[PDB]
Structure formats: structure tokens, C-alpha cells
Write a protein that binds this ligand. Sequence first.
Ligand SMILES: C[C@]12CC[C@@H]3c4ccc(O)cc4CC[C@H]3[C@@H]1CC[C@@H]2O
Ligand SMILES: C[C@]12CC[C@@H]3c4ccc(O)cc4CC[C@H]3[C@@H]1CC[C@@H]2O
Lengths: 235, 235
Amino acid sequence: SLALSLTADQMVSALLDAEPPILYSEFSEASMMGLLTNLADRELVHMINWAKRVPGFVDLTLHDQVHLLECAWLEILMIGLVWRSMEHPGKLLFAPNLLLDRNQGKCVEGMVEIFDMLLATSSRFRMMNLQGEEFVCLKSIILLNSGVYTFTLKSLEEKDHIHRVLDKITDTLIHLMAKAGLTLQQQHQRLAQLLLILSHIRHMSNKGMEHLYSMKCKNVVPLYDLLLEMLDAHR
Amino acid sequence: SLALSLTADQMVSALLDAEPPILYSEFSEASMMGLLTNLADRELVHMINWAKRVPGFVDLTLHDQVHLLECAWLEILMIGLVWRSMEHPGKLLFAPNLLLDRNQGKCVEGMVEIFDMLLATSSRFRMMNLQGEEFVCLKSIILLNSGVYTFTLKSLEEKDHIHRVLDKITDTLIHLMAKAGLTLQQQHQRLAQLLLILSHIRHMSNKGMEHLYSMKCKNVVPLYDLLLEMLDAHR
Ligand SMILES: C[C@]12CC[C@@H]3c4ccc(O)cc4CC[C@H]3[C@@H]1CC[C@@H]2O
Ligand SMILES: C[C@]12CC[C@@H]3c4ccc(O)cc4CC[C@H]3[C@@H]1CC[C@@H]2O
């Protein structure tokens, strides 16, 4: 596997390279859910493409790739938002031309809490001064670790492969940190601080599907096909 | 804060010491949900006690302690189960005298998937040969990190405190690993492997409340007060 041969430096660039393009967005509960939902549906296409370039991904069986995708779509979309929203304290930059503010969350039922969790993460990223090389690694960790406990003998081999690439990505992270000259102890603390945010992202994502789902049941969400597909995987 | 002064060794023992007693359990969807639910309600009591002894906990305001508790109760209960279920492949040891098997999950509606996730975690713990000192540390990390992004100036101080203790627990983990003689590189890989399971635990707990909540709506779950209290915090 290429994954298992690249050096921390190649890995980082490979990842830096797979990054997708930033889309542009095309207010009432319905009008807002529409934009947000539309933007999501569009990034989903890019997402799939990006997934194909994360070192090691393509080595899984075609159904396993769909599984990780279906499992982490919203997590991936949320860390992206968080990351691009970093330098806009108190706001969320869905797009370069769509910058909602906390209070605009009140437009849709039950959205403010999600916005709140999103802002808090965004803020934590600001405080830790998260680097783009770090960002790109976490995003791949999310893609690979989220659906791993839900994949038999081919699964055991699929699980190892994933664990193995996850170790490589870990090494890349530490590599990056040492290069920024953090003590060996600061390196292990940052690592742990970064990976503990992933829990919150899981948390948020779970609340996000639950919400997107009621929005769909209330018939407020449009019929975007790829987005309903990813949402159904979960239900 | 004591927390910030203990040495990795004292930290470990302090944690090893706070461990609660193992309860004993006192089949139809209703009869099963009853046992499971009853057992949970009982461990909740011990849980609160235990939380009071996790170094640094007691330094938070009284309401923040209730908040972390309300936030991580089911995550805590689930890692405990998983941990005690380790050496019983394919089974879940709720109690010393209550050992359900995967298929017994089918008794209650929607429970098998939860059991499945539980088994998978239990299995991963087996594979990594998770030590008790490690177990005790992760459990505290869960208690402290889960409700941290949902706590102002006192909050900023509360958040730092928590981040601080989190680093100390991180150091304790590494300390443990080095003592078992793992290379510096195996140390950082194991760390990341241990913390990534926390995501899955978050995920499982989220599904678990969703389920316990429908079980309650279907009027199958008894009226245990402490358990309804923790469940309501989430809703
Ligand atoms: C899924 C939601 C609509 C799509 C939103 C979105 C849309 C695009 C995007 O890049 C990130 C997110 C984060 C929050 C998501 C929202 C969570 C609640 C809502 O249902
Ligand atoms: C909360 C549930 C009943 C209580 C169960 C329990 C009860 C006691 C315990 O120590 C661990 C768990 C793990 C799974 C929990 C279940 C998840 C689904 C169910 O509703």
C-alpha cells in the first residue's frame, strides 16, 4: 500500500493535495435549511472524490469505502466548517459568501445548539492554533476511524489495514509537531488534545443527523438525492 | 489542585482506588429492559461517589460537576461494561451473575446493534490487551472531556482546569506505557489508538440514549428516578 510507504512528508502533501475546492452558496426555517442543505449536497460530490485520494482508502473493498463514507459524511462536513470558521469568532462561514452568525441559527428549530457546539469547536481550534497540515490529518483520521467498528476474515484484514494507516497518520502528526519544535511532552499532549476533539465532532454529528432527519420529516428539506442517501445510511 | 501535583504513579493509584464496587443483578423486552435499567440505576449511585474522587473533579463548581456527570453517565457505564466483558468473547457481562450473549439482545427491540457495537469495542480492548491502569485513565478522560464544550470567565477558568487535568492524565498514560517498555513510537501510537475508541464510545452512548428514550416512551422502562434524571439531562 502506498499509504504504508509514504514518508510523513509525502503523506502530508498527498493530503494537502486531495483537498476539494471551496464551493459558493447559491431567511426562514425552510429558506435557510434549503441553502445549508443544498451546499451540503454539493460538497458531498467533492467529498467522494477527495476520499479516493486519502492514502490507503482505495485499498478497501468498494463497499467498505461506501461504508466509511456513509459513516463519516457529516463529521467530515462539520470539521471542514469548523476549520474554515476559525478566524471569524462568533460566526460560521458555510461559504466564502455565506457567513451566518450565531443568532441566525434561531431561524431554524433546534439549530442554535448545533451552532453553539460548532462555535465552541471552532473556538477551541483557534485557541490551539490548529495548523492546516494538522487539519488535513484529522479529517482523514475521521474518514478512516468512524466506521471501522461496523465493517469477516476480509473484515479482519480490512480492520488491520485501517488501523495501520491510522498509525501512519499518527506518525505524520507527531512528525509535524516535532518539526514545529514542541517538546516530546508537548507533542504527546497536543496529540491527545487533537484526538479528544474528535469525540465532540462525533457527538455533534449525531445530533446533526437527528436534526436533519426531523427537518426532513417536517418536509422542510428539499429532495437532494446524495444527501438523502447519506442520511438514510444512518437511519 | 491535588490533581496538578500528583505524580503519574499517585494519579494511577488514586484512580485505581476510586473504583466502585461491582454490583450483582437483582426474558421479555419488558423483563430485560427492567434488569438492565435497574442495574444502571444502581451503578449511577456509585458513579456519583466515584466521580468525587477523580483528581481535579471536585475543583469545579457544584453545577459543573453535575453537568459532566449528566453528560457522560452512559459513556461511563458503557466503557465499564465493555471492560468487564473483555474476557468473555461474544458475550456481555452486565454483572458477575448476569452474562447476556449477543443473541439475547434480540429480546428487546433495536438492542442488537447496540450490543454489536459493545462487543466490537470489547473485542478491540481484548486485541490491544488493555490494562486496568489504562482502563481507569480513559474512564476519567471520558468523565472530564465529554461535557467540556458545554459549560463565562469562570467557564474559561473551568475549561482550563479541565484541559490541565486532561494533560496530567495524558502524561500518566504515557508514563504507564513507557514503564511497560514500549518504544517512544509505540507509545504515541497506543495513545492515539486508545483515544480513538473514545469516539466510538461517544457514538454508542448517543444511540443508547436514543434507544433508552424510546423504550421509555413505549412504557417498558420502570420509573427509576436517578436514571430518568440522567436521561432527561440529554433530552
Ligand atoms: C445537517 C445540517 C444542515 C447541513 C449543515 C452543514 C452544511 C454544509 C456544511 O459544509 C456543514 C454543515 C454543518 C451543519 C449542518 C447542519 C446540522 C443541522 C442541519 O440539519
Ligand atoms: C441504556 C440501555 C439499558 C442500560 C444498559 C446498561 C446497563 C448497565 C450497564 O452497566 C451498562 C449498560 C450498557 C448498555 C445500556 C443500554 C443501551 C440501550 C438501553 O436502553
